[PDB]
Design a protein around this nucleic acid. Sequence first.
RNA 1: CAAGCCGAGGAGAG
RNA 2: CUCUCCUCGGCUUG
RNA 3: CAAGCCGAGGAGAG
RNA 4: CUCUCCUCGGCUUG
Lengths: 686, 686
Amino acid sequence: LQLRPYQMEVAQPALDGKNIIICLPTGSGKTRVAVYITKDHLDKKKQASESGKVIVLVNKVMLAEQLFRKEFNPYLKKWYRIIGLSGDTQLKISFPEVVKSYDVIISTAQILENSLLNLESGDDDGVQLSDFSLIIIDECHHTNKEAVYNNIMRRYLKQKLRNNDLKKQNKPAIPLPQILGLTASPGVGAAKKQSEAEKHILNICANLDAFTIKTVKENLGQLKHQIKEPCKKFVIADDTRENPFKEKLLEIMASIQTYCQKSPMSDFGTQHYEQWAIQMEKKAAKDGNRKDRVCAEHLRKYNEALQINDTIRMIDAYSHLETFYTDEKEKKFAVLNLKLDETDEFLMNLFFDNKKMLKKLAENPKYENEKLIKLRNTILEQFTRSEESSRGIIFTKTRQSTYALSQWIMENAKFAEVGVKAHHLIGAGHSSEVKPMTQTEQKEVISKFRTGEINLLIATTVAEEGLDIKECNIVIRYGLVTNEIAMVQARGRARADESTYVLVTSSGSGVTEREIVNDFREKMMYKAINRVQNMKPEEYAHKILELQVQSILEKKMKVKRSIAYNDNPSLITLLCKNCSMLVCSGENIHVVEKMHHVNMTPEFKGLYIVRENKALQKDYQTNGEIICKCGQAWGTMMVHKGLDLPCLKIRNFVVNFKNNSPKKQYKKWVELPIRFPDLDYSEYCL
Amino acid sequence: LQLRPYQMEVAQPALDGKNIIICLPTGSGKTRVAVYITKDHLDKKKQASESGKVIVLVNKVMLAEQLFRKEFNPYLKKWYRIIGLSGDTQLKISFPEVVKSYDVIISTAQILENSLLNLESGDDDGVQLSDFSLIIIDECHHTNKEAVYNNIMRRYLKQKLRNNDLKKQNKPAIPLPQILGLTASPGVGAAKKQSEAEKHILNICANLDAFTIKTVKENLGQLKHQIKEPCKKFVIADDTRENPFKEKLLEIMASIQTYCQKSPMSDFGTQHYEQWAIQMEKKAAKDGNRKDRVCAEHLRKYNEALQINDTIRMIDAYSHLETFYTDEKEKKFAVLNLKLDETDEFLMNLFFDNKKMLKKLAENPKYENEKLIKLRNTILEQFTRSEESSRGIIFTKTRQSTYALSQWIMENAKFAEVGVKAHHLIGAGHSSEVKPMTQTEQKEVISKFRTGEINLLIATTVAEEGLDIKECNIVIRYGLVTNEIAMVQARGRARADESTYVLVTSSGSGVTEREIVNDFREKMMYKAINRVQNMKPEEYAHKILELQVQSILEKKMKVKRSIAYNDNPSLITLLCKNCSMLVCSGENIHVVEKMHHVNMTPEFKGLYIVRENKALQKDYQTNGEIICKCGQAWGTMMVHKGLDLPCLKIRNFVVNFKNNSPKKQYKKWVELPIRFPDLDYSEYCL
RNA sequence: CAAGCCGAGGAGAG
RNA sequence: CUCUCCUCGGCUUG
RNA sequence: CAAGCCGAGGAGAG
RNA sequence: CUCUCCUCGGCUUG
Ligand SMILES: Nc1ncnc2c1ncn2[C@@H]1O[C@H](COP(=O)(O)OP(=O)(O)O)[C@@H](O)[C@H]1O
Ligand SMILES: Nc1ncnc2c1ncn2[C@@H]1O[C@H](COP(=O)(O)OP(=O)(O)O)[C@@H](O)[C@H]1O
Ligand code: ALF
Ligand code: ALF
Ligand SMILES: [Zn+2]
Ligand SMILES: [Zn+2]
């Protein structure tokens, strides 16, 4: 209910009715400023007897829920009506009179965008920006290119231009709400010179229609006293050992490569090798030539294992290989539950003729890992010095890496002795080759991390922003560097004086250089903002108008082309990737809800096999996987109206046309230019 | 970390603070001397508590990356901060505080030149030479005329002259860094007498501000014992056969020539013929008279084929012709996808009425090639004598030649039997009529050549310098002689005792004489250096000062004229070269980023045809070629802001003016004196 | 809690 | 422009 | 990985 | 001074 002088100095111009942006460090009380501004604006509008509505837009459901339940509701419930929406709630069914029913709204931009789309094209009641008097946008740095924030503000700018036109012609013009953006680091984007950073900042300002930035410039000492930066540390690790297992991997790779008389132009263990393997497997699948598709797939698996070994223990890679190979053996045995294919035979024999030696080599404390030893030392020093008063975050690139680090931590008793309780955290996307984490589990782990029964976190890029996390004492980056904004957000985590920020990496990689470049970009952005804050109003307004007009017109020009697919379902046929054979046509495939592709015919039922659901394995089995006779996966099982149907994935097939047959693969249904009919139950019924 | 006595004797004067040059053979440890000198200089400056910064300038990104990752970083990382920059990295965004952040810098001269230009004219922070204490320039022989090295050292000399002036007037003068140049052969340039070589060496010294040369003069025996020169061999090949195919080429050439009643003043198969053909085609295109432009173009193609045959197999020339003719037929058929032009008709018929006989003649082991037989014998003898312990390099003039040699090698089983694994290597410039090689592929082939799975290389002038190559046993020059410096660099490749250097050529050409002249220049340069090393300091300094003053003043005088183009876009019109017709005007042409010329109008869209991208052909097609109705190419396709636009090449057009119309062709946009407007999306929009 | 569909952003390699 | 990795949002069948 | 722009150096022929 | 061949660097659109 009360603000600090450094908060007040930045908030004042907003209190005067000027739309602006506010860039403050992490944890400096931006939400406090937002709530105070909303209260003041509502009171001032009520004094004049004018309609007052305020809407807050965020990009995460968890953020909206937290802000409503902890910050906004407890402060304005006594005076105004507050509501918080998201995609997980049932209030969004009728949004327009959600709006007129309540005064303060917190939500995600997509809901309001959908309402606008319904109004402009749909027959629903719809909603307009004029219904609002104040719009708050947190994490405003995301307003770029064609994000939802950018679309909303594009509509706002179009309305502003229409009002400017109407100024000379009929009056009055359409009123527009005030705009308040919140952030900590707007970034520089792809900037290689100071002028590029200046242009990027001006573009952000024009997109958000900002009068100025209002960065702290007077109470710097008080702010620094309060929020204090950690000390930065670099850990560099080098090695010229760990030969045996890697050499064994390399020589088996050479054996498999010379089996197919294919010597790639690239070396082993690099992304270029993976790309070449993907290209070769794709070409082999298109041509239907076996003995190369599987070879490329196994080479890709070996490359992934080598990368994993380059980052973490050898047992992790061994586990990866054994999981893949055991799955293949189980699939083959289930199919055989006879003619074999020699290629899979020699591949399996090669893997199993050296499984024991690989396992023996993997267990060798002689050369385990330099980076892991450095991380062990860092964690132990920090925690032993904190006398049980420390908390830590570790940012890592991948998910399997998080699992490996967590289990590794639990296998060592020193972490428990010092009092270390670690947990992992990942995203919620089903497009990462691994079972994602659910929102409930994320909130739940965050809650226990807040309590303290969990000491340290092993998190992917989820944890930089949008999460309510108590200040930690140690921040670690395990070979992960993305950009300056993520760097700043991770750095701001290290409050709790006597906290430190460390980046651990090796010499071969260029991670340190990327971190340095991010630092350079930080200073470039600071200088750009410093210059921009002192620019003359006239030229500032001129350039903002120019940028807004250019953005709107280029959006118009780009949308012009988007108007643009012949429908010949019977023209195409589907072939299994490994065993090229006629699977089905485009006539037997039907669509449910225009979204689910399913084939429901008698003969097709006997062309596949059903397995158990591994996700539910670790009860009942509902969505079983679908595998081919060769062992190739086609899709899964679904139930519609209580009826069991198969759902297919286009990426598991090859398309053949009857006109000229340039067989092609589309990776998803939408890219397929042909249409499919909606389900008709008359076929194979009554 | 430790030096040899011959290295020490040359390094000592540098250790005393004297700027100098150092000329040593190839592979004698120049980088070792450089790193030791940098370490000693940094330590000595730190002893006196003085600012110390060292910058190394190179001319190739690969060289900088290699030097940083293999030589400098592993030796000074334990004491000093080392950084390596290039045009392929993101650290160059803010160079000045790259400089103050780090102590040791490795980079390409262009970056520092750009920083200086920004400081002197731009508003950026900028950089000055005074910020450095030591400047190392490798491959210093390139510092001549107006290379980047020469510009930097011109600035250095101007600063020195200003300091000399200020000596009598206000003091102190501006400090300057020490200068250390590295090379192996500074060369003689265009020298025809000993005095000319002396003048050239003095000019190089003055440009680099060198106290002396410091060439090895005492430990000659130890150096010779270590690095040993190969034995030089000349292979001369003569022939009075291979008539049929060449005579058939000549008689078809005569037929086409007498079709147009044009008997050139020159003979067939010489550069003078190609020049005359280019002049005739240019005049015909300017006059718009068809039946001569295409005739000249086909005559030029036949001349190129005859040259190729003069160097390599006949099938290579046959492939060249069939590629061109098949492309023409495909273009015509795609256009027709009707009125024909009799000229192309009889040309095509003439080509196709003898395709089979040409193919039959090309396959004839009776007379294949004398030079190729000699090369076969040389390679076989070397490799059979090396019992699988040899590596080889072959320097060839052109790229198609490298491809032909490589494929020829793979067609013969004797090379495989002896254990020969060959690979090719070319440059990375898109101005050689052939798709260039990329940097990644160059590094990658070099890596495998280092490993050994690739035995011999077929390389153009890329491989003489700037590449990390393990010593080879055989060096071959296949009819290629450029200058003494390239000769010395190629010769130095032949370490690995029992290595040999051979030049293969015929009697008609004057290649042997050019090689002999290069040897003469080598001895002339040696004598010039020997005299210069013994010159009296006073006259040496006097002449160096005179040369520096003369160079700076002539640069001033030349820059004076460079101050100097009316803008009448609507004045000109563009005509297709083959079919002279109104294509467009200078008003419908717009410019993107001041660099890309594009025409975006409705009527223009229907005036051209789109083909597939051959580079991507051997997926998706993004930059398709643009062809005319007559089959003439105009340009390609580009995408800006997601919008498909055509990009035109001026060399495919003829310019017509409305005042007096002296139609002219410019070969590139910059030479065109008129300006063009920047893209404005308002036209044909909204 | 499981399956599927669409769209968006960031990094790296080519 | 392509591939990979990572994140986010909305929508359906259960 | 594709396209385009600018500039520099070396050789040969004229 | 012109033409061709070869090499290099920097910068944009993707
Ligand atoms: N007026 C205030 N006086 C004292 N502490 C405050 C005040 N406002 C906020 N804080 C502190 O700041 C924290 C809230 O910061 P918050 O706004 O959530 O961070 P951010 O601005 O980075 O989102 C609270 O934990 C609280 O301790
Ligand atoms: N002090 C030394 N003792 C022994 N060998 C050395 C020494 N310094 C360099 N070398 C040899 O010289 C090579 C490095 O030469 P380098 O300086 O790269 O060649 P150049 O001077 O032609 O660039 C290495 O392969 C190494 O074997
Ligand atoms: F918005 Al913050 F830490 F910067 F919650
Ligand atoms: F500089 Al060298 F061989 F002469 F690398
Ligand atoms: Zn199958
Ligand atoms: Zn034409």
